[PDB]
Design a protein around this ligand. Structure first.
Ligand code: NGA
Ligand code: NGA
Ligand code: NGA
Ligand code: NAG
Ligand code: NGA
Ligand code: NGA
Ligand code: NGA
Ligand code: CA
Ligand code: CA
Ligand code: CA
Ligand code: CA
Ligand code: CA
Lengths: 129, 65, 65
């Protein structure tokens, strides 16, 4: 069930050609034998590994490439917000404006709905209960 | 390597929990269900309960378009 | 950027051409379509105007010389 590398370290056989040098060894013996890991259109590759990721992920704010190849601050810092959204002090990630005072923390910092929103009220139709 | 990430498809945004997703559309999703004589409308936010139709004979199945 | 920080292949490889342009085998850089057979090498490889373009012709107005 396992494969061994030049450093006296062993990894599952399936991991050998997964596209990441799991052995971290001098010879890079797990990936060294594997074929060309091509990447499909509408996908992108990461500087440190032979991984293929959809372009939508490139500036979504999540470290999808383990090396941080996506979310490169030069290209991704271009974002803007509050055209139809709301902003939070936590790492940038903007949410539809109506969402902020709705009564559930849409942001990790919960800055979307402090007491400043104002105390809640509700109403019903005249023919209802 | 050493962790996982969760992704919400287009039209969905991700909650602080990381594991959960919420829907981006403003219109409230609602539930429609039918008894023998009634078709009823209930909102997932729990704020509203209303009637679609009454007096039908036996409403055994519903679908929408 | 002397280090090649710009032109990062992940982001910049997204380019497309020939909506209104022409393409050359030399490093990607597309030029307006009309430019290719105009008679001056708009591309470093001069692939914009090989003999395939066809031998040149010119015309003038009936009242001219
Ligand atoms: C205090 C009050 O009457 N609040 C609202 C009212 O403004 C109106 O929206 C109504 C509609 O049914 O619901 C209730
Ligand atoms: C940023 C981060 O470390 N995220 C998760 C962590 O919360 C935990 O769930 C772990 C379990 O393997 O995976 C990773
Ligand atoms: C052979 C010939 O007559 N060529 C052109 C003709 O097609 C027309 O474009 C004209 C206009 O002045 O110029 C000349
Ligand atoms: C590989 O091993 C040789 C001999 O032990 C060593 O000199 C060299 O620096 C190593 N290279 C890397 C990249 O680990
Ligand atoms: C892999 O890359 C080659 C070029 O090196 C071709 O473009 C091929 O079509 C690619 N294959 C896949 C499945 O993306
Ligand atoms: C958001 O981005 C747009 C892009 O056209 C504008 O630059 C706008 O000024 C930005 N909003 C803010 C708050 O600066
Ligand atoms: C150029 O880019 C556009 C972007 O919408 C299309 O993907 C188009 O298919 C591309 N052209 C070619 C020749 O592939
Ligand atoms: Ca591997
Ligand atoms: Ca990302
Ligand atoms: Ca909220
Ligand atoms: Ca993992
Ligand atoms: Ca030319």
């Amino acid at each position: 069930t396992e494969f061994t590398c030049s450093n006296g370290r062993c990894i599952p056989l399936s991991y050998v050609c997964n596209g990441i040098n799991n052995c971290h060894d001098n010879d890079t013996s797990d990936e060294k034998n594997c074929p060309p890991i091509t990447c499909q259109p509408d996908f992108a590759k990461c500087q440190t590994t032979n991984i293929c990721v959809p372009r939508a992920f490139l500036c979504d704010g999540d470290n999808d490439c383990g090396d941080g190849s996506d979310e490169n601050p030069i290209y991704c810092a271009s974002h803007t917000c509050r055209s139809n959204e709301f902003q939070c002090v936590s790492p940038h990630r903007c949410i539809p404006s109506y969402w902020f005072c709705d009564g559930e923390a849409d942001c990790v910092d919960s800055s979307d709905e402090p007491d400043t929103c104002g105390h809640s009220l509700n109403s019903c139709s005249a023919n209802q209960f | 390597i050493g962790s996982y990430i969760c992704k919400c498809a287009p039209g969905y945004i991700r909650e602080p929990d990381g594991k959960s997703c919420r829907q981006n559309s403003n219109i409230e999703p609602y539930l429609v269900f039918s008894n023998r004589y009634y078709i009823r409308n209930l909102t997932i936010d729990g704020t509203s309960y209303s009637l679609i139709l009454q007096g039908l004979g036996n409403v055994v199945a519903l679908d929408f378009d």
